[PDB]
Design a protein around this ligand. Structure first.
Ligand SMILES: COc1ccc2nc(C)c(O[C@@H]3C[C@H]4C(=O)N[C@]5(C(=O)NS(=O)(=O)C6(C)CC6)C[C@H]5/C=C\CCCCC[C@H](NC(=O)OC5CCCC5)C(=O)N4C3)nc2c1
Ligand SMILES: [Zn+2]
Length: 197
């Protein structure tokens, strides 16, 4: 009881820059400053962009702003708060059944717009700033046009699947692999986010 520890906050440690012609990852905080920010929940760094790279003490993954909510996966964040300039921010959405959590989008973030195109030609954005073409195959599944080892997708849960026009279609949740090769991905459809809201 006296020694009861508390888990740290999720910390923004970088972002995927989709501003220009070339997508690229940027780190905005090193491990040590991430360690201290997770403990205090106090993050003074300027936030920019739609796709953040986030980290706990033991995991790193992505988080994506859609309609004023920073979304990510429950299997990464659990019920953790996120660090912010004035302290830990409690989740405003939690759904273990969808593998989904959300906090209010940070000041300075930009939000993606929910897709209403009805298109099945999608693009998955990874933590290494790869933009991977994906054909939608169902409400929550898409196939990679070019399969690759799951190693290349590890750490990209919470990232977005986008339509051709750059709208958010879903949040990357899991990889479907055969012999360690990712042939398809499962994602939380944006409609399921909009219902949660
Ligand atoms: C605890 O409470 C909950 C509640 C609901 C939950 N719901 C799901 C689906 C779930 O799955 C866990 C976590 C998830 C995952 O690894 N996600 C990725 C990632 O990158 N994570 S991560 O960022 O590195 C990190 C771990 C740091 C956060 C994108 C993957 C990239 C590579 C995967 C390689 C090896 C894993 C293949 C596996 N495949 C699979 O399960 O496929 C089946 C499900 C649908 C199709 C069939 C898979 O993908 N996952 C296993 N845990 C849950 C836990
Ligand atoms: Zn669209």
């Amino acid at each position: 009881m006296a020694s009861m520890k508390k888990k740290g906050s999720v910390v923004i440690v970088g972002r995927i820059n989709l501003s220009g012609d070339t997508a690229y990852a940027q780190q905005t905080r090193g491990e040590e400053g991430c360690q201290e920010t997770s403990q205090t929940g106090r993050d003074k760094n300027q936030v920019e962009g739609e796709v953040q790279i986030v980290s706990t003490a033991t995991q790193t993954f992505l988080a994506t702003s859609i309609n004023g909510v920073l979304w990510t996966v429950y299997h990464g964040a659990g019920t953790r708060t996120i660090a912010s300039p004035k302290g830990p921010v409690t989740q405003m959405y939690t759904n273990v059944d969808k593998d989904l959590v959300g906090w209010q989008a940070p000041q300075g973030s930009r939000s993606l717009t929910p897709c209403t195109c009805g298109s099945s030609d999608l693009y998955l954005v990874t933590r290494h700033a790869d933009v991977i073409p994906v054909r939608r195959r169902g409400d929550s599944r898409g196939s990679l046009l070019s399969p690759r080892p799951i190693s290349y997708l590890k750490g990209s849960s919470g990232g977005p699947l986008l339509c051709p026009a750059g709208h958010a279609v879903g949040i990357f949740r899991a990889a479907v692999s055969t012999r360690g090769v990712a042939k398809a991905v499962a994602f939380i459809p944006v409609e399921s986010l909009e219902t949660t809201m």
